[PDB]
Amino acid sequence: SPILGYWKIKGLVQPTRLLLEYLEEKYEEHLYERDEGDKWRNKKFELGLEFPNLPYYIDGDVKLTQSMAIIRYIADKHNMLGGCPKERAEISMLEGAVLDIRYGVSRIAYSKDFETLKVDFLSKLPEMLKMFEDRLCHKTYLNGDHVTHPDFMLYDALDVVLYMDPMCLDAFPKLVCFKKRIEAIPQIDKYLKSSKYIAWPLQGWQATFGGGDHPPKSDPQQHHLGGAKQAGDV
Amino acid sequence: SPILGYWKIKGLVQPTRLLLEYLEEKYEEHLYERDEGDKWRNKKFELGLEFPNLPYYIDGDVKLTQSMAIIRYIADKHNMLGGCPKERAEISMLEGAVLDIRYGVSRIAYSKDFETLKVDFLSKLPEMLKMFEDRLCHKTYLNGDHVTHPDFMLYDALDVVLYMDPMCLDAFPKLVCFKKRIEAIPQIDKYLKSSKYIAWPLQGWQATFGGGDHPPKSDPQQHHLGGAKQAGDV
Ligand SMILES: N[C@@H](CCC(=O)N[C@@H](CS)C(=O)NCC(=O)O)C(=O)O
Ligand SMILES: N[C@@H](CCC(=O)N[C@@H](CS)C(=O)NCC(=O)O)C(=O)O
């Protein structure tokens, strides 16, 4: 059975976990705890990875690193990347646009002066969310009536920014509905309430925002889940 | 002919320019000069782009944004993405590993503390480069006998880090050989010596590193390219 290795946090791999659950695909996870950085380093170069890094995905005759290569690989095995160059480009564009939001958070989540850097991030966020809001006019998912991996990437991004600003989706009803729609998918609903769900942290434990072993205050605001704030996976 | 829009700098789109030249695909560029930020802003939402941004690519079949969606699209139409999920994942992994280096630069290039932040980046750069050095063992290009888009992304990354650390490739003979081989490709040699080549800046003009109108002194480390330290185009 395939192995997905990463820190026991949402971070870069959460969208991949969501896609795997969405596809109801069987996989095992090697979860590195907060103080297991030493364990990681001792195995980093003994796994047969050509470009050692976290996350990594190992299955039948396939050893991969790079979060985006991994999530795209899983989608590709289920014929979800796109039927022609144009559609594949549309999917990669959506992908990159979600990354601008998600990485936008991580870019300043570890800074000592997060409280001041966010005011700017949150001022540029509406413009970014608006494009997804418009994309969803008459569309159930990004790309139409069918689910694609960027939907899970966007979901992850929405989950994270909601913590930073619980009201950032007030002017975007379609995005609110989108979030609920993903959570309403049977396999996802079950997963979010399961013991394998990792609700926190959002970033690496050391982060000023979305860090720590448990959700602090002035951030933990995002309804509809199952809990598991105390990690819970191993 | 397709239209490629971006600032008149290398930045996010240089690898794409290199790919188009390699393919000898005819294209036109809409280059935004140092002072044309408002020209861009006045047209940003008037081009039909679903996710307005720079770079943008427009042809008879699509209107795209997101640099990676664009370079992948061009590669996809030229049968360079991979024949199966395993190979496509390999390419995407190569792609992501190159981005850790290229974005590693961009993430600190605008900081006022660049000069110090680069210490940590340069400390980790050797390990990143080594992965590519090993990959090139017994291979002409990153994916073997045939060129793929990550080759041009890597070329761009090498060009850029050479400016930050002129000595960073000394311990990597394969990478130096690789860089010469890319510069040896007829279409690339011609491009690098043409008036369309934008040798500088590497980042936005306002960047601490790779900014300004011309390259700094002593640090310039990368030849086989046309002079025009400025830029020169339209
Ligand atoms: N571009 C890579 C980034 C990989 C990365 O930065 N991983 C960090 C955590 S966010 C890590 O702990 N890597 C393990 C290492 O550096 O050895 C990806 O998307 O997978
Ligand atoms: N993730 C995007 C980044 C796009 C981006 O942020 N572009 C910057 C230049 S590095 C820009 O000036 N965008 C135009 C804008 O924001 O209006 C990509 O890879 O294309």
From Swiss-Prot, chains A, B:
Swiss-Prot/TrEMBL catalytic activity: RX + glutathione = an S-substituted glutathione + a halide anion + H(+)
GO molecular function, one term: glutathione transferase activity
Ranges for domain GST C-terminal: 84-202
Residues the entry annotates as binding glutathione: 6-7, 40-44, 53-54, 66-67
UniProt-listed Enzyme Commission number(s): 2.5.1.18
InterPro entries: Glutathione-S-Trfase_C-like, Glutathione-S-Trfase_C_sf, Glutathione_S-Trfase, Glutathione_S-Trfase_N, GST_C, GST_superfamily, Thioredoxin-like_sf
Keyword Transferase: yes
SUPFAM superfamilies: GST C-terminal domain-like, Thioredoxin-like
One Pfam family it belongs to: GST_N
Description of how the protein assembles with itself and partners: Homodimer.
PANTHER family registered for this protein in UniProt: GLUTATHIONE S-TRANSFERASE, GLUTATHIONE TRANSFERASE
Name of this protein: Glutathione S-transferase class-mu 26 kDa isozyme
